[PDB]
Amino acid sequence: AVNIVDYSDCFEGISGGAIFCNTKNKEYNIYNKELIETRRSPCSTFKIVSTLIGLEKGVINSKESVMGYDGTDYPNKNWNKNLSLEEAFKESCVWYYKKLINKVDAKSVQNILDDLKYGNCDISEWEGDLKNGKGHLNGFWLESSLQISPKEQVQTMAKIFEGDTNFKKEHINILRDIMAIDVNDANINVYGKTGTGFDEKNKRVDAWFVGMLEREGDTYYFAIKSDDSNKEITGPKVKEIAINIIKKYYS
């Protein structure tokens, strides 16, 4: 079932959409249906799935796991260390996740994405958007071949966290741990991942916050997405919007 809602009062004039799905019923609450059905690059929200792939394949094993930092200099101080999975996820550290995924064969990734119904499941540009000049800081999930709609993101999150995929429960629990966020409200549990990209062809941001809300035995899977022309709109900004929606409409 689809219920059209209006969350514009939480978007602060930023263009976008939101979708929330409750496990109990079959209700999707949808703000901006056209946008919620449009596939876009997941950007760093793909780290939700790449973490699970790495765990399943044994590239990493726990929230402490490391990827063998080699000393390469980066502008973000927190990337210049042998950071753990938990830290790499929270920092959105591209080198860690590029190295992780490059230890996994493409057929294994293809089959996992197919089974998750992860959007277009298109990994045909493995090295990513090389025209941007960033070299190895690139991949199929970053403004490249792989695209997924906000609705598909919510459907994928629900399958993962309701225990309906092939991934091990222990691995799902690691993801829950590293996705947990502080929202200054002890009576809900919010989990998610930001994503920040720019679609150069259409001159619009791909700014995401995707995750899950737990409130008194109810669970909602959500995806908030901006497509604003304002290049200053980032994943963290959309996360603020998501929290305002949760506080106003999901309390």
Q: What DSSP string runs through 188-211?
A: SEEEEEEEEEEETTTTEEEEEEEE
The technique is X-ray
Range of the domain at 163: 1-251
**Residue 170 CB contacts under 8 Å (≥ 6 apart), including other chains:** none
Distance between CA 136 and CA 134 in Å, rounded?
A: 6
* C-alpha of 6 from chain center: 23
In the chain, where does DSSP find H-type helix? 33-36, 47-56, 85-91, 94-101, 106-116, 150-161, 169-179, 235-249
Q: Which two tokens stand for residue 118?
A: 């992860």
150 C-beta neighbours (distance < 10 Å), count = 28
Resolution, angstroms, 1 dp = 1.4
What is the rounded CA–CA span in Å between residue 118 and residue 35? 17
DSSP 3-state of 104: coil
Taking a C-beta distance cutoff of 8 angstroms, is the pair 152, 53 a contact? no
Q: 189-214: string of b/e by CB count within 10 Å (b at 16+)?
A: ebbbbbbbbbeeeeebbbbbbbbbbe
- Classify 177 as helix, strand or coil: helix
| Number of domains forming the structure of the chain | 1
Residues 14, 233: contact at Cβ < 8 Å? yes
Q: What residues contact residue 103 under an 8 Å CB cut-off, 6+ apart?
A: 54, 57, 59
End-to-end CA distance of the chain: 21
Residue whose tokens read 């990513």: 128
